[PDB]
Design a protein around this ligand. Structure first.
Ligand SMILES: CCOC(=O)Nc1cc(-c2ccc(C)c(NS(C)(=O)=O)c2)nn2c(C)nnc12
Length: 125
């Protein structure tokens, strides 16, 4: 790595999830999106109590306005993005590609996270 900072190791992995298929879904807050209708955004607040997204996590890592205290909170927040998407959207029908996109980015995240030194950088800091 030759980095030493665990937060940059988190940002590196976040930037790699941005290159995944339909990554635009998880980039900005769904509740701020002008693309979705208010009807769907009002059901979202009822179904999802804690919304999250990549730009919100990225801004929380740069704090060093909340701040991510450790890799364990970063892991929670990234996985929260994919579980909210998989709770809100169906895994069957014509628009099942939204759920499937969350599922594949979660799978990509686990593979990057499991082979990362992010905890060894945090533990030795
Ligand atoms: C059939 C009804 O269901 C839905 O439309 N579902 C969801 C839709 C979108 C969504 C759409 C369009 C755009 C352009 C974006 N990108 S953004 C938020 O950065 O502006 C996201 N995100 N999403 C997330 C997460 N979780 N569920 C959904």
């Amino acid at each position: 790595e030759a980095d030493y900072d665990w937060r940059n190791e988190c940002l590196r992995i976040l930037n790699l999830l941005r290159k995944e298929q339909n990554s635009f879904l998880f980039e900005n807050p769904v509740l701020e999106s002008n693309d979705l209708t208010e009807e769907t955004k009002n059901r979202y607040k009822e179904v999802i109590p804690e919304a999250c997204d990549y730009i919100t996590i990225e801004k929380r890592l740069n704090n060093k306005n909340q701040t991510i205290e450790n890799p364990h909170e970063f892991e929670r927040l990234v996985k929260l993005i994919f579980s909210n998407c998989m709770i809100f959207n169906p895994n069957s029908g014509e628009c099942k590609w939204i759920y499937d996109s969350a599922k594949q980015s979660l799978n990509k995240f686990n593979n990057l996270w499991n082979k990362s030194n992010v905890f060894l950088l945090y533990s030795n800091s």
